[PDB]
Amino acid sequence: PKSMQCKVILLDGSEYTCDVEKRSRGQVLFDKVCEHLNLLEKDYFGLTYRDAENQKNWLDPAKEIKKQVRSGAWHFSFNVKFYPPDPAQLSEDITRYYLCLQLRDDIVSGRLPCSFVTLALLGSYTVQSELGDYDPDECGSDYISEFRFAPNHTKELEDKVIELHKSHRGMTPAEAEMHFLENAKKLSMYGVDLHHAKDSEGVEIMLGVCASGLLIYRDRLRINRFAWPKVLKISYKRNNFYIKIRPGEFEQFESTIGFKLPNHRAAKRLWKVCVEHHTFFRLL
Ligand SMILES: CC[C@H](CO)NC(=O)Nc1ccc(Cl)cc1
């Protein structure tokens, strides 16, 4: 029975290797990675792979791995798929731990924009969790952490992390992770999956998918929001993505908003992540 080697980049940046039967569905690999991680609250997570065009795709746990990765390497990342609007409601500390690790990457990468003060506050909770109580013996007036806090590091940001770190004496890792998440969950781009698109007039926009609904970023002063409730139906055809917006009370007919995606695969990918978010956040 022939087995394919799988390599998974974990959220701590290390590599898990395992084997699965070559006709295995994605769930099989996902279950192995989750067991390795001691993760029971698996519903928020998934594996990604890079397609022939270098786009990130979610591995569908219901479909054969080989029919998704196709001609590519059996190389994956472990990621947060559904960012919980209220991490305090998660049943386990280890779930919140992996959620923190994902968010740290979202921040360092620039995917999750963040004010100077919030970068320093998030950094201080990471340091408290990882190193425990502030120690001057480690940190001098010229200290620079091994920890990556932001897309661009400044001495001012390193200093502010240390100042806030001093204030967290006695805080345990679970406590510091909860405080991290209480701050992170309020950021305007928390758990927003951005897709490049054009409106019906050809103007370049971003479509954001998240817990609350579908976001349209256009002029930066014109941000349209469609709560999952107001979204009646989602469709794709060729390079186009369509959402049907329910009529206001007393309106006879739904409105259709059409978008142009870069290609047919980008349209399909957007449609699938919308359906998945809509189902997930309709059961939450
Ligand atoms: C690559 C991940 C690094 C190194 O292991 N760990 C880390 O940053 N952990 C963490 C983050 C935030 C909080 Cl609050 C608590 C712990």
From Swiss-Prot:
Coiled coil: none annotated. Disulfide bonds: none annotated. Expressed at high levels in brain, with lower levels in kidney, intestine, and testis. Detected in lung. Residues 4-284 form the FERM domain. It is found in: Cytoplasm, Cytoskeleton; Cell junction; Cell membrane; Cytoplasm. It comes from the Eukaryota. Tumor suppressor that inhibits cell proliferation and promotes apoptosis. Modulates the activity of protein arginine N-methyltransferases, including PRMT3 and PRMT5. Interacts (via FERM domain) with CADM1. Interacts (via FERM domain) with PRMT3; the interaction is direct and inhibits the protein-arginine N-methyltransferase activity of PRMT3. Interacts with PRMT5. Interacts with PRMT6. This is Band 4.1-like protein 3. It comes from Homo sapiens. The lineage of its organism: Eukaryota, Metazoa, Chordata, Craniata, Vertebrata. The gene is EPB41L3. The chain holds residues 107 to 390 of 1087 of the full protein.
